[PDB]
Enzyme design. Sequence first.
Site, PDB file in Angstrom:
ATOM      1  N   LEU A   7       0.815  -1.205   0.000  1.00 16.83           N
ATOM      2  CA  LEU A   7       0.000   0.000   0.000  1.00 16.83           C
ATOM      3  C   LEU A   7       0.856   1.266   0.000  1.00 16.83           C
ATOM      4  O   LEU A   7       1.872   1.346   0.693  1.00 16.83           O
ATOM      5  CB  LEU A   7      -0.913  -0.011   1.235  1.00 16.83           C
ATOM      6  N   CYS A   9       8.942   2.221  11.500  1.00 13.74           N
ATOM      7  CA  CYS A   9       7.947   1.236  11.113  1.00 13.74           C
ATOM      8  C   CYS A   9       8.545  -0.145  10.930  1.00 13.74           C
ATOM      9  O   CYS A   9       7.864  -1.123  11.191  1.00 13.74           O
ATOM     10  CB  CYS A   9       7.238   1.638   9.819  1.00 13.74           C
ATOM     11  N   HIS A  53       0.249   8.627   8.974  1.00 12.09           N
ATOM     12  CA  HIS A  53       0.237   8.222  10.364  1.00 12.09           C
ATOM     13  C   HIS A  53       0.661   9.414  11.211  1.00 12.09           C
ATOM     14  O   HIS A  53       1.055  10.455  10.678  1.00 12.09           O
ATOM     15  CB  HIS A  53       1.148   7.026  10.591  1.00 12.09           C
ATOM     16  N   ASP A  97       3.283  -1.389  13.118  1.00 13.78           N
ATOM     17  CA  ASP A  97       1.841  -1.297  12.978  1.00 13.78           C
ATOM     18  C   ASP A  97       1.070  -2.461  13.624  1.00 13.78           C
ATOM     19  O   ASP A  97      -0.078  -2.249  14.028  1.00 13.78           O
ATOM     20  CB  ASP A  97       1.470  -1.193  11.489  1.00 13.78           C
ATOM     21  N   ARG A 147      -3.855  -6.337   6.145  1.00 10.79           N
ATOM     22  CA  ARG A 147      -2.684  -6.432   6.998  1.00 10.79           C
ATOM     23  C   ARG A 147      -2.965  -7.141   8.312  1.00 10.79           C
ATOM     24  O   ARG A 147      -2.066  -7.228   9.152  1.00 10.79           O
ATOM     25  CB  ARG A 147      -2.147  -5.038   7.305  1.00 10.79           C
ATOM     26  N   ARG A 168      -6.496   4.637   9.811  1.00 10.27           N
ATOM     27  CA  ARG A 168      -6.148   3.311  10.283  1.00 10.27           C
ATOM     28  C   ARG A 168      -6.372   3.084  11.780  1.00 10.27           C
ATOM     29  O   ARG A 168      -6.164   1.957  12.243  1.00 10.27           O
ATOM     30  CB  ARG A 168      -4.691   3.048   9.950  1.00 10.27           C
ATOM     31  N   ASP A 174       2.984  -5.928   3.090  1.00  8.34           N
ATOM     32  CA  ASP A 174       3.414  -4.916   4.043  1.00  8.34           C
ATOM     33  C   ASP A 174       3.904  -5.526   5.357  1.00  8.34           C
ATOM     34  O   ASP A 174       3.864  -4.867   6.401  1.00  8.34           O
ATOM     35  CB  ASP A 174       2.263  -3.955   4.316  1.00  8.34           C
ATOM     36  N   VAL A 224       6.493   3.304  -0.498  1.00 11.71           N
ATOM     37  CA  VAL A 224       5.320   2.634   0.049  1.00 11.71           C
ATOM     38  C   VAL A 224       5.038   3.110   1.481  1.00 11.71           C
ATOM     39  O   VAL A 224       4.478   2.359   2.298  1.00 11.71           O
ATOM     40  CB  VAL A 224       5.480   1.099  -0.042  1.00 11.71           C
TER      41      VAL A 224
END
Length: 276
Positions: free
Chosen positions: A23, A267, A166, A72, A91, A138, A66, A261
């Site tokens: 994504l 992350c 984010h 995440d 995800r 999200r 991902d 991405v």
Amino acid sequence: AAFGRATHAVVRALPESLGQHALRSAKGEEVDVARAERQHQLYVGVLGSKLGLQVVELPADESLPDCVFVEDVAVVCEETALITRPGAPSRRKEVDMMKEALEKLQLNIVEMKDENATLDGGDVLFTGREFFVGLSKRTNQRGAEILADTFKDYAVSTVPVADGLHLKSFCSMAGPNLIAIGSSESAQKALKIMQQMSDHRYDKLTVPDDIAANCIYLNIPNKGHVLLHRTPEEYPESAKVYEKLKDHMLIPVSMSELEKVDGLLTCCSVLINKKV
């Protein structure tokens, strides 16, 4: 003990399906998967060989493009691991290989299994004192409440995040009581919401590029304050702002292929402080 202490780092290998199927917000260039794999093994080698963390490297999954962005799916504060429910429904099977890794490290595991709750851990900024949870596309209010019931010792506050981002797309901790912050209008508004809701004054560090405000602060034994930031070859004006921190050990880490991405520095790891 100290803020930013870690002993363990949980990472995940990159699938070859990342270059076409992971994504991305924005529209741009094609992803070199081999250059994204070399940039990620330099990152693991900073945490493992250069800083001496104990690295659990989870295998890649080609149905999960991902799966490298492991922050995440897990929020770890002290020895308690909140296994999150991610906001993208594709995800949500990345929590399976994370849960095995964190119970092999014998942490306390709380699973977010409520069907109305979403939380990405890239919306979670842990300052050492308190939590800021970004309310985004999200992460809803119900996922922020499940994070508040898991970590009852810490204040949890909510900040609205502008669309496609984010919360840690423009901020991270660059040290104790020090928030790096981007200079865009969505970043600067969110820092003013975060500074009026807290009891404490945070020191502020404005970098001109917003993706370059995502940095990794670590307290490493016998090496001191360690800051992993983006390179001067990627972002020259924001890396000279990081070079004014002369008490920090500065390591430039390139992340130029995973930025297509929307994958930033924080992350791709979950940092664990395991004690005796």
